[PDB]
Amino acid sequence: MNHYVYILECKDGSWYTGYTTDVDRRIKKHASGKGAKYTRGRGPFRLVATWAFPSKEEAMRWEYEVKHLSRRKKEQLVSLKGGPYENTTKLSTT
């Protein structure tokens, strides 16, 4: 199965942790791509980062541990990878 841990920054500033596991999203994108463009989204879910694990236990333990750790370590987790520079959204850079 496909284990993707997504962390979304909510309207409040709290990071929403949860890993998804459905093949449907993958095939859906390919099916939709036939006569469609990449552009799709609005908010208010801000994607900070995405962690993909081919391993069952790693996906379960990662989720479980981010649920385990406090805010301070939750911040540190993003400080390891997820930094504003890694967002590469736009800001003002051409």
UniProtKB/Swiss-Prot annotation:
Provenance organism: Halalkalibacterium halodurans (strain ATCC BAA-125 / DSM 18197 / FERM 7344 / JCM 9153 / C-125)
Membrane-spanning ranges: none
InterPro entries linked: GIY-YIG_endonuc, GIY-YIG_endonuc_sf, UPF0213_domain
Descriptive protein name: UPF0213 protein BH0048
PROSITE patterns listed in its UniProt record: GIY_YIG (PS50164)
SUPFAM superfamilies reported for this sequence: GIY-YIG endonuclease
Cross-referenced CDD domains: GIY-YIG_UPF0213
Pfam family membership, one: GIY-YIG
Every GIY-YIG domain range: 1-76
Family: Belongs to the UPF0213 family.
